[PDB]
């Protein structure tokens, strides 16, 4: 997934 | 966003305090009503994926809806990756790379890569694809956040027909007729409407029942 | 909207937060009073069909009126299709196509097709035709949303003439005189007005009855 | 019709 | 309105949300007080007859005053027609026609005809003539809407002279001195003022009576 | 007259 | 007002809704306090005599002060006429005439004559002379509108020194020291201040008496 | 005088 | 900030009253909630280190957080100094010097040195490095300012699932799942969720538990 | 102020209604808190001495602080006169004169002389020197207007450590540590802090004491 | 002194 | 350190 729970929009894993 | 300057060229300008301000205010006052989606579509006109990200992060409530949006964006980015693979190796110097599904979301791609994609001929509208994914998210949340079903909307005995039609159609918009509208009406109004028959505009019904 | 830049060319700019803000605020505070129509006509000056659509979708109440507007726009689009047929086949490459009745509403036509139609010589003012249809809708709703008939407006015994004239003419504007205004007046004021006779301006009546 | 009940402005059937 | 761009040419720009907003707000809060006329004169600076019409239609109250304005505009348009007749026949192609009395009001003339008249050498200031007629209307309403006559304004025994002068001159402005101001004053203040005599500025009177 | 009672500003008879 | 465009020329632009709005709001909230004069001086920067007239007419209260301003402007216009006579005859065609004392006030002079005087080399700053006269009026009103004399300002026994100094100097500004400030102080604070002696800044006094 | 009591600013006698 | 003018060059413009106004208002109303960080990132777009300093100094509360930010900026400036040493001697005349760790913070560097670094090819984005340090500070404060731990968030018996998910994810964002979300839920909702099993989107859970 | 136009030249523009509005509002709401100084420094960016004077005169309260500022400006102008004498005689025609200490304050110098000094190569930044003097005044007032000393700030028994640190550092900023912060803390929190020892960041203290 | 008590900013003695 | 407690942002020791 491009986005994961717990971080702001636009940040990689 | 990406705007057109007075000289006649498309340049990136910095987001105004009002796009953010109005966005936070509409999400705060109107929650996730259907009309909130056009606001986002109108406020973020010409916006970069980074700008869209600022707008999304500015909201401080309804975090479960935000996670819905996250999951929707990941599904769409995976579908983009599947549909449009991109090579790796080395990025050619002084050259523009292909946009990944993660690039459109702005997670890996930087703002200079973004405005390179937008100011191109033909341009790669990464902002528009990201807007499509965010909007798909928003429609999904709005549809599944509706308070009551269309079957629940029924006209009261003392309630005017206008209020019943308003409730019926706000619920219909929330979840994205003709025959159903008459069924939920009380015996009054329905007495005249059944006599009217097919082929009457909404206004004919509301005029006869006024 | 489509504006004129400082250099001297017509370019599309992105809708401001205030056109949306003021539009939602006027529809929220003034409902569908007659003066609300000019606001739309003034706020949407130079606006594209897409912009008009944003303005219409921003409102969150009075959905039955919105369906009136929908039906009006479909009737007008069908009449446009009937009056101005357009060929099919293949759209010529690098060429501008004819605007359908659905195109003017912005359902099929995209924004690039729209600004192609507006920035043309001679230009196809799809925005103006769409504004005509939306305005026909708005006049229709406003006329049929009037609370009371002009026959109902009558002057009270203790009410000043000014208030009676104000009520009479706000009702007359809502539903789009000379003899009728005197008939609804009480025996007072009418005593002097019947003596005045024909040929007196509204101000002569309101001055003598002041 | 260009517009039908239940969808936003500017969307085809 | 008709403004001057940065390049150095007079172009039509679309009315701002604030001209409308401030206009509705001043007519709502201040009704038809005299200072409301300059606002219209200042808010509508450079405005086209169509823009003036939007401003007039935006107001939602005081419809009798609006009909006063209507009648005034018709009288002035008839006088324009009488003073400046215009030929009929066929409008020459690619040519600018003469402005009728109805054209200045914007009833028949379209916006392109309007900006043709304004961007001319020498220009036909149809906006300025229309502003003259609207302003004549406004002065007429404001003069005949005054609550009390100047004879009614009298100074109270315990009231300061400042308040009496303020009331006196607001009433004098509403209906468009020297000897009258002293007559309405109480025996106090008048005791000193009669001793002052002719040739004293307003401030000499208000200083001696302070 | 250019304007009559019952219609908005800028509309002919 | 008369501004400098982006190209590099001085052009007349139309007064903004905020100059009027802020002006009415400051005169409404702050009445004629001294700080209201700089606002006028700052809000009307670059303004034409017509613009200054709009600002003056926008106020709806304190009409006696407005008549003070009127009389001041007439006295100054008479002094201008006396100091700088101007010939009559015929105004030369395509030529700029001399500004009368009434012209600077904007009573006879039109806006085109005004911007001709301002956009000149050397320019005739009719706006600046009119601003001088209006400001002389404003200082005169503000000085004679002061609630209490500087002799009245005295420090209370339980009142802090800071409040006494604030009152003293707001009154001193309203009517346009060193020894007087100590005399009005109570025996407390004065006990230390008399010991301080001459040569101490205001802050030395307020620090020792803190 | 340039201005007289009873009329707006900028108007002659 | 550093913006792009209409001509097509990057120039320093002076900070607007709204960047400051909106910044103080968001820190006043929202304290240090996570969404406050994007606001700073969006409001300070293109801002110089001096501008960032103005924004930071405008806040009047939460001074301990400001000292956290101070310490973070000093640690980052020391790391910059350690990673990128710069020579001393004499600054060459008419030449641009190297940016120290203290220079990026704006303590020694002046605004002309700053805009020299930004308007360079290749440019030294001192504003972006300073923004990175300020943002690291902000994330640190926001993470350590969270009211309760994620373990504390548990769903009540009568509370809807939507509210529990909202609380859970606002807490998760404050401190920067799948299995944990089900554990904190009451026996109701968990009854169906345990039956659902792995592989279900957040919306599947919230739909089944609606 | 002195801004850079789109063409690429530094021109004087007229102060906006918001610089004045925001300035009066911040001095009215925040009095003389430390963060009020950056506002002035940010609102008056690029401002002329005349503009700075307008900002200073707009405030209507705290006149004793204004006299502090006056005295500070006179001391600095005397020091400028002493450090940089200027010749007298006749000002050369079409030439720019030297700035006196009184000129920087704007008492003798006119606005044309000011913009001549600013638009020069090398420019004489009279606005920046005046800003330096005004700021020295402001820091002086803010330091001597502090309500309580840093010694007074002590942590309560039931008060959280966060509030104590906030109070301590707002007082420290008002009057322009490490060991002192622990001394004022209650026996609780100090129990752990004394065990922590030297070398711990503020956040280590506030985390252990959370 | 450049400024004295009792007059606005920017005015000489 | 670049910044110390007790002074505004952007000022040296
Ligand atoms: O209309 P809002 O959403 O409530 O925002 C406004 C508004 O913003 P604008 O300057 O762009 O118009 C103001 O002007 P108004 O049009 O409302 O008159 C302003 O000044 P006002 O005192 O005249 O309203 C003000 O008021 P304030 O800052 O004291 O709240 C302010 O409200 P916001 O702070 O919410 O932005
Ligand atoms: O100058 P600011 O305080 O930074 O804000 C201005 C401004 O306010 P003032 O003219 O009172 O100074 C505009 O004035 P109006 O057009 O409202 O009369 C304005 O207008 P909008 O609200 O329509 O945008 C808009 O910028 P612009 O003049 O280019 O339209 C805006 O900046 P913000 O809205 O972002 O605060």
PDB file of C-alpha atoms in Angstrom, chain B residues 61-192:
ATOM      1  CA  UNK B  61     -12.026  15.353  12.765  1.00  0.00           C
ATOM      2  CA  UNK B  62     -13.633  12.297  11.184  1.00  0.00           C
ATOM      3  CA  UNK B  63     -10.407  10.293  11.126  1.00  0.00           C
ATOM      4  CA  UNK B  64     -12.205   7.050  10.240  1.00  0.00           C
ATOM      5  CA  UNK B  65     -13.355   8.726   7.030  1.00  0.00           C
ATOM      6  CA  UNK B  66      -9.730   9.726   6.493  1.00  0.00           C
ATOM      7  CA  UNK B  67      -8.700   6.079   6.780  1.00  0.00           C
ATOM      8  CA  UNK B  68     -11.430   5.171   4.285  1.00  0.00           C
ATOM      9  CA  UNK B  69      -9.833   7.728   1.967  1.00  0.00           C
ATOM     10  CA  UNK B  70      -6.397   6.238   2.668  1.00  0.00           C
ATOM     11  CA  UNK B  71      -7.536   2.718   1.769  1.00  0.00           C
ATOM     12  CA  UNK B  72      -9.287   3.982  -1.365  1.00  0.00           C
ATOM     13  CA  UNK B  73      -6.126   5.800  -2.455  1.00  0.00           C
ATOM     14  CA  UNK B  74      -4.021   2.678  -1.879  1.00  0.00           C
ATOM     15  CA  UNK B  75      -6.424   0.533  -3.904  1.00  0.00           C
ATOM     16  CA  UNK B  76      -6.342   3.074  -6.738  1.00  0.00           C
ATOM     17  CA  UNK B  77      -2.544   3.372  -6.571  1.00  0.00           C
ATOM     18  CA  UNK B  78      -2.209  -0.411  -6.756  1.00  0.00           C
ATOM     19  CA  UNK B  79      -4.535  -0.413  -9.768  1.00  0.00           C
ATOM     20  CA  UNK B  80      -2.434   2.334 -11.379  1.00  0.00           C
ATOM     21  CA  UNK B  81       0.748   0.341 -10.737  1.00  0.00           C
ATOM     22  CA  UNK B  82      -0.896  -2.746 -12.233  1.00  0.00           C
ATOM     23  CA  UNK B  83      -2.221  -0.905 -15.292  1.00  0.00           C
ATOM     24  CA  UNK B  84       0.856   1.286 -15.929  1.00  0.00           C
ATOM     25  CA  UNK B  85       4.135  -0.369 -14.880  1.00  0.00           C
ATOM     26  CA  UNK B  86       7.248   1.804 -14.902  1.00  0.00           C
ATOM     27  CA  UNK B  87      10.884   0.831 -15.397  1.00  0.00           C
ATOM     28  CA  UNK B  88      13.567   1.320 -12.743  1.00  0.00           C
ATOM     29  CA  UNK B  89      17.308   1.500 -13.382  1.00  0.00           C
ATOM     30  CA  UNK B  90      18.699   5.005 -13.310  1.00  0.00           C
ATOM     31  CA  UNK B  91      16.601   8.146 -13.825  1.00  0.00           C
ATOM     32  CA  UNK B  92      18.135   9.803 -16.857  1.00  0.00           C
ATOM     33  CA  UNK B  93      19.853  13.099 -15.955  1.00  0.00           C
ATOM     34  CA  UNK B  94      17.866  16.221 -16.729  1.00  0.00           C
ATOM     35  CA  UNK B  95      14.894  14.020 -17.615  1.00  0.00           C
ATOM     36  CA  UNK B  96      11.367  13.445 -16.345  1.00  0.00           C
ATOM     37  CA  UNK B  97      10.467  10.045 -14.910  1.00  0.00           C
ATOM     38  CA  UNK B  98       7.236   8.066 -15.179  1.00  0.00           C
ATOM     39  CA  UNK B  99       4.623   8.591 -12.441  1.00  0.00           C
ATOM     40  CA  UNK B 100       4.051   5.613 -10.172  1.00  0.00           C
ATOM     41  CA  UNK B 101       0.784   4.991  -8.379  1.00  0.00           C
ATOM     42  CA  UNK B 102       2.537   6.179  -5.228  1.00  0.00           C
ATOM     43  CA  UNK B 103       3.860   9.225  -7.102  1.00  0.00           C
ATOM     44  CA  UNK B 104       0.361  10.482  -7.939  1.00  0.00           C
ATOM     45  CA  UNK B 105      -0.481  10.393  -4.225  1.00  0.00           C
ATOM     46  CA  UNK B 106       2.608  12.481  -3.453  1.00  0.00           C
ATOM     47  CA  UNK B 107       4.226   9.983  -1.086  1.00  0.00           C
ATOM     48  CA  UNK B 108       7.469   9.538  -3.049  1.00  0.00           C
ATOM     49  CA  UNK B 109       7.194  12.257  -5.700  1.00  0.00           C
ATOM     50  CA  UNK B 110       8.440  15.708  -4.729  1.00  0.00           C
ATOM     51  CA  UNK B 111       6.885  19.029  -5.708  1.00  0.00           C
ATOM     52  CA  UNK B 112       9.447  19.694  -8.451  1.00  0.00           C
ATOM     53  CA  UNK B 113       8.673  16.307 -10.000  1.00  0.00           C
ATOM     54  CA  UNK B 114       4.988  17.206  -9.714  1.00  0.00           C
ATOM     55  CA  UNK B 115       5.210  20.552 -11.495  1.00  0.00           C
ATOM     56  CA  UNK B 116       7.411  18.882 -14.106  1.00  0.00           C
ATOM     57  CA  UNK B 117       4.574  16.450 -14.794  1.00  0.00           C
ATOM     58  CA  UNK B 118       1.961  19.224 -14.936  1.00  0.00           C
ATOM     59  CA  UNK B 119       3.988  21.675 -17.056  1.00  0.00           C
ATOM     60  CA  UNK B 120       4.541  19.167 -19.848  1.00  0.00           C
ATOM     61  CA  UNK B 121       3.398  18.720 -23.453  1.00  0.00           C
ATOM     62  CA  UNK B 122       1.435  16.553 -23.310  1.00  0.00           C
ATOM     63  CA  UNK B 123       1.072  17.052 -19.549  1.00  0.00           C
ATOM     64  CA  UNK B 124       0.667  14.175 -17.119  1.00  0.00           C
ATOM     65  CA  UNK B 125      -2.253  15.400 -14.946  1.00  0.00           C
ATOM     66  CA  UNK B 126      -1.150  13.679 -11.738  1.00  0.00           C
ATOM     67  CA  UNK B 127      -3.220  16.224  -9.827  1.00  0.00           C
ATOM     68  CA  UNK B 128      -6.330  15.175 -11.743  1.00  0.00           C
ATOM     69  CA  UNK B 129      -5.746  11.450 -11.149  1.00  0.00           C
ATOM     70  CA  UNK B 130      -5.155  12.102  -7.455  1.00  0.00           C
ATOM     71  CA  UNK B 131      -8.316  14.224  -7.389  1.00  0.00           C
ATOM     72  CA  UNK B 132     -10.174  11.313  -8.986  1.00  0.00           C
ATOM     73  CA  UNK B 133      -8.992   8.946  -6.252  1.00  0.00           C
ATOM     74  CA  UNK B 134      -9.734  11.411  -3.432  1.00  0.00           C
ATOM     75  CA  UNK B 135     -13.162  12.051  -4.922  1.00  0.00           C
ATOM     76  CA  UNK B 136     -13.907   8.320  -5.186  1.00  0.00           C
ATOM     77  CA  UNK B 137     -13.044   8.149  -1.505  1.00  0.00           C
ATOM     78  CA  UNK B 138     -15.322  11.099  -0.717  1.00  0.00           C
ATOM     79  CA  UNK B 139     -18.324   9.695  -2.607  1.00  0.00           C
ATOM     80  CA  UNK B 140     -17.784   6.366  -0.838  1.00  0.00           C
ATOM     81  CA  UNK B 141     -17.762   7.961   2.633  1.00  0.00           C
ATOM     82  CA  UNK B 142     -20.725  10.220   1.855  1.00  0.00           C
ATOM     83  CA  UNK B 143     -22.799   7.315   0.541  1.00  0.00           C
ATOM     84  CA  UNK B 144     -22.064   5.142   3.559  1.00  0.00           C
ATOM     85  CA  UNK B 145     -22.481   8.017   6.056  1.00  0.00           C
ATOM     86  CA  UNK B 146     -26.147   8.650   5.230  1.00  0.00           C
ATOM     87  CA  UNK B 147     -28.299   8.830   8.389  1.00  0.00           C
ATOM     88  CA  UNK B 148     -31.396   7.056   7.044  1.00  0.00           C
ATOM     89  CA  UNK B 149     -32.443   5.043   4.011  1.00  0.00           C
ATOM     90  CA  UNK B 150     -34.691   6.352   1.248  1.00  0.00           C
ATOM     91  CA  UNK B 151     -37.326   3.853   2.407  1.00  0.00           C
ATOM     92  CA  UNK B 152     -37.462   5.628   5.775  1.00  0.00           C
ATOM     93  CA  UNK B 153     -38.363   9.013   4.258  1.00  0.00           C
ATOM     94  CA  UNK B 154     -42.153   9.248   4.572  1.00  0.00           C
ATOM     95  CA  UNK B 155     -44.417  12.284   4.559  1.00  0.00           C
ATOM     96  CA  UNK B 156     -46.201  13.192   7.770  1.00  0.00           C
ATOM     97  CA  UNK B 157     -49.911  14.001   7.972  1.00  0.00           C
ATOM     98  CA  UNK B 158     -49.445  17.657   8.960  1.00  0.00           C
ATOM     99  CA  UNK B 159     -46.155  18.117   7.087  1.00  0.00           C
ATOM    100  CA  UNK B 160     -46.264  20.110   3.831  1.00  0.00           C
ATOM    101  CA  UNK B 161     -45.421  18.314   0.613  1.00  0.00           C
ATOM    102  CA  UNK B 162     -42.456  20.658   0.045  1.00  0.00           C
ATOM    103  CA  UNK B 163     -40.681  19.441   3.191  1.00  0.00           C
ATOM    104  CA  UNK B 164     -41.273  15.796   2.275  1.00  0.00           C
ATOM    105  CA  UNK B 165     -39.840  16.293  -1.227  1.00  0.00           C
ATOM    106  CA  UNK B 166     -36.849  18.142   0.246  1.00  0.00           C
ATOM    107  CA  UNK B 167     -36.094  15.338   2.713  1.00  0.00           C
ATOM    108  CA  UNK B 168     -36.636  12.654   0.059  1.00  0.00           C
ATOM    109  CA  UNK B 169     -34.231  14.250  -2.394  1.00  0.00           C
ATOM    110  CA  UNK B 170     -31.538  15.184   0.130  1.00  0.00           C
ATOM    111  CA  UNK B 171     -31.533  11.515   1.153  1.00  0.00           C
ATOM    112  CA  UNK B 172     -31.493  10.463  -2.509  1.00  0.00           C
ATOM    113  CA  UNK B 173     -28.471  12.695  -3.127  1.00  0.00           C
ATOM    114  CA  UNK B 174     -26.694  11.408  -0.011  1.00  0.00           C
ATOM    115  CA  UNK B 175     -26.786   7.806  -1.276  1.00  0.00           C
ATOM    116  CA  UNK B 176     -26.515   8.574  -5.029  1.00  0.00           C
ATOM    117  CA  UNK B 177     -37.204   8.868  -8.755  1.00  0.00           C
ATOM    118  CA  UNK B 178     -40.887   8.951  -9.697  1.00  0.00           C
ATOM    119  CA  UNK B 179     -42.894   6.006  -8.368  1.00  0.00           C
ATOM    120  CA  UNK B 180     -41.189   5.827  -4.962  1.00  0.00           C
ATOM    121  CA  UNK B 181     -41.900   9.482  -4.147  1.00  0.00           C
ATOM    122  CA  UNK B 182     -45.670   8.949  -4.299  1.00  0.00           C
ATOM    123  CA  UNK B 183     -45.616   5.743  -2.234  1.00  0.00           C
ATOM    124  CA  UNK B 184     -44.153   7.430   0.852  1.00  0.00           C
ATOM    125  CA  UNK B 185     -46.729  10.244   0.756  1.00  0.00           C
ATOM    126  CA  UNK B 186     -49.707  10.284   3.117  1.00  0.00           C
ATOM    127  CA  UNK B 187     -53.264   9.630   1.848  1.00  0.00           C
ATOM    128  CA  UNK B 188     -53.619  13.381   1.484  1.00  0.00           C
ATOM    129  CA  UNK B 189     -51.625  14.660  -1.500  1.00  0.00           C
ATOM    130  CA  UNK B 190     -51.619  11.061  -2.771  1.00  0.00           C
ATOM    131  CA  UNK B 191     -55.364  11.463  -3.384  1.00  0.00           C
ATOM    132  CA  UNK B 192     -54.651  14.083  -6.050  1.00  0.00           C
TER     133      UNK B 192
END
